[PDB]
Coordinates of N, CA, C and O and ligand atoms in Angstrom, one line a residue:
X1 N 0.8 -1.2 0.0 CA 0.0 0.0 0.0 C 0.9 1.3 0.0 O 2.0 1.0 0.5
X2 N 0.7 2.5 -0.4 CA 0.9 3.7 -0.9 C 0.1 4.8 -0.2 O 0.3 5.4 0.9
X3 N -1.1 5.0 -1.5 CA -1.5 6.4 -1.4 C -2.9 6.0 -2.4 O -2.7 5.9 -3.6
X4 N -4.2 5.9 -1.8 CA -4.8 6.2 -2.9 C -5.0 6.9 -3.9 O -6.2 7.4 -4.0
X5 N -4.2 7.2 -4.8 CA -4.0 8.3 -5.7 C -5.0 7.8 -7.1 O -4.9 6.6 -7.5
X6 N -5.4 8.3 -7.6 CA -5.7 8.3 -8.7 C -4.6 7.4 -9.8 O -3.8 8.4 -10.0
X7 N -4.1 6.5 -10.3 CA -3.3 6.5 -11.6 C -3.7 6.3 -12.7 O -4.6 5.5 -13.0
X8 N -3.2 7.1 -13.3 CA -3.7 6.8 -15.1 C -2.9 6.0 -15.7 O -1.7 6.0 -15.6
X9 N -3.6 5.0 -16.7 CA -3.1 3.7 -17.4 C -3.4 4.5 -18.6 O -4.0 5.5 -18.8
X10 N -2.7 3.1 -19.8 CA -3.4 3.1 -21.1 C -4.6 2.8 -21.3 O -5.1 1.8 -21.7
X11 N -5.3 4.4 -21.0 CA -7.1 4.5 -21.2 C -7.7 4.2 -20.1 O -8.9 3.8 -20.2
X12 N -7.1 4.4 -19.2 CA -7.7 4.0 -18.1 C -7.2 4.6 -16.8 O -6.3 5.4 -16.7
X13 N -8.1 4.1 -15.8 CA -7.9 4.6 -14.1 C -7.9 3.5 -13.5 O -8.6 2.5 -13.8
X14 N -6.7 3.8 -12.4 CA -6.8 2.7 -11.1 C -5.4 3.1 -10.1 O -4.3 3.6 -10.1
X15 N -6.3 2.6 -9.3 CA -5.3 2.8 -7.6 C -5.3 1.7 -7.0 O -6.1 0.8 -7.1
X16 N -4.2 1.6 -6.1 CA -3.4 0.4 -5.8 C -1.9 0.6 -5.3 O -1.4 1.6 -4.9
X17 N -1.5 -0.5 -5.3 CA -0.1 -0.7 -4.7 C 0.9 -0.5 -6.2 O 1.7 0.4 -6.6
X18 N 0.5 -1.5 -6.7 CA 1.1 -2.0 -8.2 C 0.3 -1.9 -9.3 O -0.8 -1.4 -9.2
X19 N 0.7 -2.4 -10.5 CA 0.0 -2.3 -11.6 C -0.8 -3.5 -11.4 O -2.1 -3.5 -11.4
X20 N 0.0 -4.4 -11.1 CA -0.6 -5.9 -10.8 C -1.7 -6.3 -9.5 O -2.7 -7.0 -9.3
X21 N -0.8 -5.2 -8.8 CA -1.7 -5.0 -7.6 C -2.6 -4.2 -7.4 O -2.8 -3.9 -6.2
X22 N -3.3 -3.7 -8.2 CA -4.2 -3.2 -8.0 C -5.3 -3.2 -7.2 O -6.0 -4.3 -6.9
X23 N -5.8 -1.9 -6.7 CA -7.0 -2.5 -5.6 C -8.3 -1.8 -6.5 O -9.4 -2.4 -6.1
X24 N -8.5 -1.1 -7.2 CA -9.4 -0.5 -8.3 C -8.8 0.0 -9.5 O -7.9 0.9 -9.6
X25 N -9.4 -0.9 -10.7 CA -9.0 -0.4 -11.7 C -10.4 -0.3 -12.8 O -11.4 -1.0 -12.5
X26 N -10.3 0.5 -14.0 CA -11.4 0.9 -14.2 C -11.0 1.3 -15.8 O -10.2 2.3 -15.9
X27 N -11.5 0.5 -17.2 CA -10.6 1.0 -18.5 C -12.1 1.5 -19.1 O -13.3 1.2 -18.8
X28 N -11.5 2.2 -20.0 CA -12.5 2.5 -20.9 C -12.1 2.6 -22.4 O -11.2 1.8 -22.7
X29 N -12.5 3.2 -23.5 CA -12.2 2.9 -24.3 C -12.9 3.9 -25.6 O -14.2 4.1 -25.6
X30 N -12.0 4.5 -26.6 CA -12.7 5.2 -27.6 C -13.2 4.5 -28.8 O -12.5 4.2 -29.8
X31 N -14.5 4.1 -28.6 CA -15.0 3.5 -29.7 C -15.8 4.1 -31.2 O -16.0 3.5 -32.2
X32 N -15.9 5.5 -31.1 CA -16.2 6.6 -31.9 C -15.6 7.0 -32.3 O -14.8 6.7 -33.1
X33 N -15.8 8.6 -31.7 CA -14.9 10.1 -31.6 C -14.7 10.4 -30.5 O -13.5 10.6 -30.2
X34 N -16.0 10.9 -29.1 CA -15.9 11.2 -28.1 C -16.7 10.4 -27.4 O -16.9 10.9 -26.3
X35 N -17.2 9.3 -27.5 CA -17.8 8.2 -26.4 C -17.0 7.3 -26.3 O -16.3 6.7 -27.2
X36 N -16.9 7.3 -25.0 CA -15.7 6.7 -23.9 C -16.7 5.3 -23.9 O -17.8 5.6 -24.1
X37 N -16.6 4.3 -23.9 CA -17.2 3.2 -23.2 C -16.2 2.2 -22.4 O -15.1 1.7 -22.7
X38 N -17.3 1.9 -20.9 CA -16.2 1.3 -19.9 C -17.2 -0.4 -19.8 O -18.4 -0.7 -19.6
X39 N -16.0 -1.2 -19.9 CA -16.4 -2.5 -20.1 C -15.9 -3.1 -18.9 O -16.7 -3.8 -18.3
X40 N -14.8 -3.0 -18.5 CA -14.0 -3.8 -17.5 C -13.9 -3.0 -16.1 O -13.8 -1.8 -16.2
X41 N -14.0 -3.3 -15.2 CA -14.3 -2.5 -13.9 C -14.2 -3.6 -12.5 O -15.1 -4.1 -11.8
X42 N -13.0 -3.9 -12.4 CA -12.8 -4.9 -10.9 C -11.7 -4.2 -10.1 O -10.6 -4.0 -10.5
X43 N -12.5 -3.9 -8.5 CA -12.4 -4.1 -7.2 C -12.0 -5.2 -6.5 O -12.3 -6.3 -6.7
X44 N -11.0 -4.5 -5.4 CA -10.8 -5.8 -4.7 C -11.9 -5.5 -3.8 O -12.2 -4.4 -3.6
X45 N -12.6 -7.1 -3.0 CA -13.8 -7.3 -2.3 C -13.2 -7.6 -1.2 O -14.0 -7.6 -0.3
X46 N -11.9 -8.0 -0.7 CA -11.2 -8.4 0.0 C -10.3 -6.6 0.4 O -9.1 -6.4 0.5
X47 N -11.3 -5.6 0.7 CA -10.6 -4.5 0.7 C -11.0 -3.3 2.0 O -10.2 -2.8 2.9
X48 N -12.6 -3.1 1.6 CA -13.2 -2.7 3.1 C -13.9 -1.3 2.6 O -15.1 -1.0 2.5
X49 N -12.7 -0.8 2.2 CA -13.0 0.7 1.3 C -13.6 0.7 -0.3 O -13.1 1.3 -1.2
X50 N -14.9 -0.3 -0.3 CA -15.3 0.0 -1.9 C -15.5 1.4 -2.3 O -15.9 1.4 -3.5
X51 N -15.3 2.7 -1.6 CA -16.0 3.5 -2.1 C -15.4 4.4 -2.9 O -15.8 5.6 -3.1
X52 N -14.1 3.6 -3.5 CA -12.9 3.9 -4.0 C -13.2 4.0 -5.8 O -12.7 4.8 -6.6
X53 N -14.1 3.0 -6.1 CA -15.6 2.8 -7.2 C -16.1 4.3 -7.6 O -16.2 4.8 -8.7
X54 N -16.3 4.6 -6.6 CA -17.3 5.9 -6.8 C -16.3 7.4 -7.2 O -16.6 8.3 -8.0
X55 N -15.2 7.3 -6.5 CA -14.0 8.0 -7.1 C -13.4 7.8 -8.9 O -13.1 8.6 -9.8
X56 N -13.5 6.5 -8.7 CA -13.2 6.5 -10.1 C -13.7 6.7 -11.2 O -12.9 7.0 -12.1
X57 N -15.3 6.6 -11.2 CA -16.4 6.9 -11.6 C -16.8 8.2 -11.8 O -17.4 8.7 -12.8
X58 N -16.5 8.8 -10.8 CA -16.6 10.4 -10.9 C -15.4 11.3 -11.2 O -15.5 12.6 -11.2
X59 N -14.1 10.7 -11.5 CA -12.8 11.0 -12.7 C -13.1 10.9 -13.4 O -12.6 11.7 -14.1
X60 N -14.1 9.8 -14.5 CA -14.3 9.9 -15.6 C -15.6 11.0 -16.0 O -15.4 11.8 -16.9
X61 N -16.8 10.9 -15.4 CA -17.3 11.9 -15.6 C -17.4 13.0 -15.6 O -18.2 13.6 -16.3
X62 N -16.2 13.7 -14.5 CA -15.9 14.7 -14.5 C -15.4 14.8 -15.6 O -16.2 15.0 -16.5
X63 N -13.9 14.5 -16.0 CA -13.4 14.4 -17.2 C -14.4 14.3 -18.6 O -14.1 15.0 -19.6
X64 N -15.3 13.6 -18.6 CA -16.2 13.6 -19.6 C -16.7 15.1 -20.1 O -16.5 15.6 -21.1
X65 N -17.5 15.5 -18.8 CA -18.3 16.7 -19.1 C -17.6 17.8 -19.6 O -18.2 18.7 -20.3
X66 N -16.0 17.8 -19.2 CA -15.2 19.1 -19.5 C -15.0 18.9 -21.2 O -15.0 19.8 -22.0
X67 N -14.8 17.4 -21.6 CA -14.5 17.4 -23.1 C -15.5 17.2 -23.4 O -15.4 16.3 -24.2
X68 N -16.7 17.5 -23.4 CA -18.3 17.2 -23.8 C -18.1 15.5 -24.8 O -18.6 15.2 -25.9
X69 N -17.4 14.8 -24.0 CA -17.2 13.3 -24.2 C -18.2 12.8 -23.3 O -18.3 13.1 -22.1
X70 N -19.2 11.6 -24.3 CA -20.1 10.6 -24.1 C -19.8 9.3 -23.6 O -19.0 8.5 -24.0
X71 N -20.6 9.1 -22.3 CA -20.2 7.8 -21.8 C -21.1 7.1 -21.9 O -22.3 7.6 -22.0
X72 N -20.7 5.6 -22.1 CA -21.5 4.1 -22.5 C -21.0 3.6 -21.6 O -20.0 4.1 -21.1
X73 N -21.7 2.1 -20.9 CA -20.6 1.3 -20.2 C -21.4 -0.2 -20.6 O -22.5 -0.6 -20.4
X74 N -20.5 -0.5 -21.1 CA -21.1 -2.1 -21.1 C -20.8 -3.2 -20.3 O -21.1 -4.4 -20.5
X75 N -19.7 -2.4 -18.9 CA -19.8 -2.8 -17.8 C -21.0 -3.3 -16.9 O -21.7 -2.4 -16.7
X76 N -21.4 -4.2 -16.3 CA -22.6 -4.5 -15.6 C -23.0 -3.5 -14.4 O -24.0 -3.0 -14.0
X77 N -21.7 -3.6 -13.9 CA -21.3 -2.9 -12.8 C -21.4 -1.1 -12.4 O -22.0 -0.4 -11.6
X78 N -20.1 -0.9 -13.7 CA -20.3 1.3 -13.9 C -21.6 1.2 -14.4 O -22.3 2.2 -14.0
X79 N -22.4 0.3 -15.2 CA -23.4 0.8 -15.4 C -24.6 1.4 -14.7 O -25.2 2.4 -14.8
X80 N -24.7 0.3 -13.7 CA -25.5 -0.1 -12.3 C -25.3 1.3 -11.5 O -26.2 2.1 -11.1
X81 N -24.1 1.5 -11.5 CA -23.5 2.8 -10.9 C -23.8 4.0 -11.4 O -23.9 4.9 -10.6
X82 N -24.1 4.2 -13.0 CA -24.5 5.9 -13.6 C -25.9 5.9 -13.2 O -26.6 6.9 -12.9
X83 N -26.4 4.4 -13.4 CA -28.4 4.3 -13.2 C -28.0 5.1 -11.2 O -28.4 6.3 -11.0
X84 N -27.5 4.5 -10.5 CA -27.5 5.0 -9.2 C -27.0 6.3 -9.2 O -27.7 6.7 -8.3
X85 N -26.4 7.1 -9.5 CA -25.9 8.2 -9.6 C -27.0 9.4 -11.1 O -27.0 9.5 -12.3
X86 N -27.7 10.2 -10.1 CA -28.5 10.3 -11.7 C -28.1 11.9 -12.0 O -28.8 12.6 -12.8
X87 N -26.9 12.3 -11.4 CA -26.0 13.1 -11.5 C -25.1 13.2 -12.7 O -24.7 14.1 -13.4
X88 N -25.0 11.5 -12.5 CA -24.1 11.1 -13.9 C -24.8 11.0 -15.0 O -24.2 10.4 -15.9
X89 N -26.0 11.4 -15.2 CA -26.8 10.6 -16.2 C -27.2 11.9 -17.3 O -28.1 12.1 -18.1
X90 N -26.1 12.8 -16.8 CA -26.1 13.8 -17.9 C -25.0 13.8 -19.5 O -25.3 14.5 -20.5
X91 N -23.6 12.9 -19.2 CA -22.7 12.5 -20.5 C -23.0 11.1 -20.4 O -22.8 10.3 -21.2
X92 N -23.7 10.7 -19.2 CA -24.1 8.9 -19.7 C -25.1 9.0 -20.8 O -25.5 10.1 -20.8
X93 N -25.5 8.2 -21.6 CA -26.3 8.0 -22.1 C -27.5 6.9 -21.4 O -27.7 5.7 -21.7
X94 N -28.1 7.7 -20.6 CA -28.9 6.6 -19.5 C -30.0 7.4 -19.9 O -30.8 7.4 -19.0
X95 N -30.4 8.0 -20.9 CA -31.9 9.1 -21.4 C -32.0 8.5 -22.9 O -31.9 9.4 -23.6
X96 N -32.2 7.3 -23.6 CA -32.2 6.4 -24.3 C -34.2 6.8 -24.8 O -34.5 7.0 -25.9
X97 N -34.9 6.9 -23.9 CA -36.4 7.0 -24.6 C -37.6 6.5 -23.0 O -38.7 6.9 -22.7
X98 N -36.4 5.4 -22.3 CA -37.6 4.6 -21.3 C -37.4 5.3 -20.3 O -38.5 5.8 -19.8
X99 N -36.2 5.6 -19.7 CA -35.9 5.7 -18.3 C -36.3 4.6 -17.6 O -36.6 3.5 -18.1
X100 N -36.2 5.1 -16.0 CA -36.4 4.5 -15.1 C -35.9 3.0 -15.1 O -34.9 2.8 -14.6
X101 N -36.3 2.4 -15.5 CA -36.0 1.1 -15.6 C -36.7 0.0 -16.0 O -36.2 -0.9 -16.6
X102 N -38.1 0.1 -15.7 CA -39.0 -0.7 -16.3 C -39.8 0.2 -17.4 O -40.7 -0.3 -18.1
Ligands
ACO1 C1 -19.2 -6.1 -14.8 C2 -17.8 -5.9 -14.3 O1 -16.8 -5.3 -15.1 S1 -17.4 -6.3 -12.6 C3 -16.6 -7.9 -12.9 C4 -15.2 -7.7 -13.4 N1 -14.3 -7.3 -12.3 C5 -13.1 -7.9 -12.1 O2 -12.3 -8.2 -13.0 C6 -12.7 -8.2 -10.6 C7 -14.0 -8.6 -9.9 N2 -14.2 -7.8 -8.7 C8 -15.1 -6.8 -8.7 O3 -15.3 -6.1 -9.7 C9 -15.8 -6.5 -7.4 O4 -16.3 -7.7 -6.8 C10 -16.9 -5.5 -7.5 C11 -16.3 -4.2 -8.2 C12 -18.0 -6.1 -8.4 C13 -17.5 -5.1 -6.2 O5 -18.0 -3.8 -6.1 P1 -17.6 -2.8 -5.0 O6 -16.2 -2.4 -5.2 O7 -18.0 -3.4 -3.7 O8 -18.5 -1.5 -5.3 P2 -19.7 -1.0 -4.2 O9 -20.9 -1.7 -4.6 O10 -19.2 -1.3 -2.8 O11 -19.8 0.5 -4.4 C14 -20.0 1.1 -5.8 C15 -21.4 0.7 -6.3 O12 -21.4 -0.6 -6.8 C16 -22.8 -0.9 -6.9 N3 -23.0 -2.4 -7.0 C17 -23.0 -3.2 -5.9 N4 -23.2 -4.4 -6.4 C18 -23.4 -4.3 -7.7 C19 -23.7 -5.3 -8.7 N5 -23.7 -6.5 -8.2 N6 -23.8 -4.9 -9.9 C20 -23.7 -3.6 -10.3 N7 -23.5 -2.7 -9.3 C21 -23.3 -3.0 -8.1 C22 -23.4 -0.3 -5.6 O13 -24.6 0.4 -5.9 C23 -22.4 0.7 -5.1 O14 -23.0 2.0 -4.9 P3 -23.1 2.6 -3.4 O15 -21.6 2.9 -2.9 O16 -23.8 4.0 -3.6 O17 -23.8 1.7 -2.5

């Protein structure tokens, strides 16, 4: 252990000890022009502090809004997370036609 710091990878965020060791890491990916989409998203559960998740989550969004970049997640997980956050659900694309959920 270190410093929960923020690190930036190739396209990506995570914090941790090592690269390998990671305790949150979080990729995304430019599949357009300006829509980021995040597919891959693993936490250690063996950690205490998940709320390390919601940090990372909200570096990318932040980041999003300032480059008026579009977020997708085909993550199970970030996605779960922008529907819970409806803060985020302004560069998410979570305003599709249904809302809510059902
Ligand atoms: C679909 C994916 O990319 S996850 C699977 C791939 N990941 C890996 O490679 C490693 C596997 N390990 C993991 O990812 C971990 O077990 C995790 C990330 C799934 C556990 O999540 P945590 O780090 O505990 O996040 P935690 O739930 O505590 O906090 C962030 C949000 O996740 C949300 N969440 C919890 N469970 C789920 C779930 N099963 N599915 C979607 N979102 C969930 C919660 O709403 C939580 O919000 P809250 O803090 O307001 O309550």
């Amino acid at each position: 252990m270190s410093n929960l710091e923020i690190k930036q990878g190739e396209n990506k965020f995570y914090i941790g000890d090592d690269e390998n060791n990671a305790l949150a890491e979080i990729t995304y990916r430019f599949v357009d022009n300006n829509e980021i989409n995040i597919d891959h998203t693993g936490v250690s559960d063996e950690l205490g502090g998940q709320g390390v998740g919601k940090k990372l989550l909200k570096a990318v969004v932040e980041h999003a809004r300032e480059n008026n970049l579009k977020i997708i997640a085909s993550c199970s997980f970030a996605k779960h997370m922008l529907e819970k956050e409806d803060s985020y659900q302004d560069v998410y694309l979570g305003l599709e036609h249904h809302h809510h959920h059902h």
